Amino acid sequence: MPTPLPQLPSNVRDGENNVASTFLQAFFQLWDHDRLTLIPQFYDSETTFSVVFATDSPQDPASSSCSKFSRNLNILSPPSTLQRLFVGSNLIADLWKVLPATRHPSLDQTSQWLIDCHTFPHLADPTGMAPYAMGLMINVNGQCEEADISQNLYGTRTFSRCFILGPSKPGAPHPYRVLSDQLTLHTWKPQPAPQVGTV
Amino acid sequence: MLSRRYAAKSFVEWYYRQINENKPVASGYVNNNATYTKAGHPPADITINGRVVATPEEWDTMLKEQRAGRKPVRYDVDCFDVHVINADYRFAAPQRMIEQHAPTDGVRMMMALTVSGSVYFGASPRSTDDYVIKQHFNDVFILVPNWDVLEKPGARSARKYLIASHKYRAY
């Protein structure tokens, strides 16, 4: 007699300004083509980034990339299989370069995304005038087209990504910043490689 | 081991052990804590598969609703990860706690936790191959310190940190 829980549509409680939708649209638009530019725009010294692997797929790009990253780093020696990887503000740029090339769908297609988000209290206040500040949690479940070009590796990634947004420091680009970025890569299914013929 | 990771791992273990043991998980939420309620903390923000829930008890009831030789529902935590989003959390805290503990002592910290795994419906208690239907779940918590407990030498990671926000997704 078992019956799984009801799967309602993704409720985006980002208020009246719809800041979550804007941030997500911009973020993924940037993430696809020029992700590094996200760092000066939305990321900080207090920001922290993690990548986790929920499953051990065969010959997936992300694992090999992150493995090479961990092995290359002078900072420590772990061994074979890494489940997760954590980096502070100073190594996010260095890590995002190694990650595979990704193509995400537009947010217009609600069928492709499960975006739950809300605002929570008692965050830290960067301005330092008040004890607390209010933050915005954005949990995103979706998929994308993940690709390694150096190797001939191309496939579809299912993933979850959690953003903790908060007020930014004075003299920052935007009114808010990313406090924490938690990426979870569930699975990678191989797909046919796009081909372009020229003459 | 990192203080945050320990608290995280341990909370995870408790929580899903409680769910799999058909026990209430409402206790882990800030709603039933007296100090936070006295301090004037909002109720925990629980969201199940896109549905906003009022109280952890309702969520505990939903967990019973879902359960309707094979086990009806079982949760398998594949992975998790925890970040610190406030190094200096002081809400609902006694004065002593702020002076005794520093942000580098890894006690007064607000944590953003993410957990991902599978959900087996009508499967053998130990087999991951045979099942009626298999869901993939991704939980997200916001954990806050329990000021009443961090004084007591005895330690339950279950109480040690409380849920303020919860986002459940399964597909």
Numbering used by the authors:
A (entry chain A): 364 to 441, 444 to 564
B (entry chain B): 1 to 68, 81 to 183
What did the study's authors say about this model?
The Mex67–Mtr2 complex (NXF1–NXT1 in metazoans and small bristles in Drosophila melanogastor) is the principal mRNA-export factor in Sacccharomyces cerevisiae. Mtr2 is a ∼15–20 kDa protein that also has an NTF2-like fold and forms a tight heterodimeric complex with the Mex67 NTF2L domain.
In the complex, ctMtr2 was not altered when compared with the isolated structure, with a Cα r.m.s.d. of 0.38 Å over 148 residues. More recently, the NTF2L domain and Mtr2 have also been implicated in binding ribosomal subunits and rRNA, whereby in S. cerevisiae specific long internal loops may be involved in direct RNA binding as well as domain organization to form a continuous RNA-binding platform with the RRM and LRR domains. There was clear density for these loops in the ctMex67NTF2L–Mtr2 crystal structure, but as in hsNXF1NTF2L–NXT1 they did not form an extended surface, suggesting that ctMex67–Mtr2 may not be involved in ribosomal export in C. thermophilum in the quite same way as in S. cerevisiae. The position of the pre-α1 loop, which has been implicated in the spatial arrangement of the Mex67 domains in S. cerevisiae, occupied a similar position in ctMex67NTF2L to that observed in S. cerevisiae and H. sapiens. In particular, Leu368 was buried in a hydrophobic pocket present in ctMtr2. Notably, Leu368 was positioned in a structurally equivalent position to scMex67Leu263 and hsNXF1Leu370, indicating that the NTF2L pre-α1 loop position may be conserved across species. C. thermophilum Mex67–Mtr2 retained features found in both S. cerevisiae and H. sapiens and conserved the hydrophobic pocket identified as the nucleoporin-binding site found in NTF2L domains from other organisms.
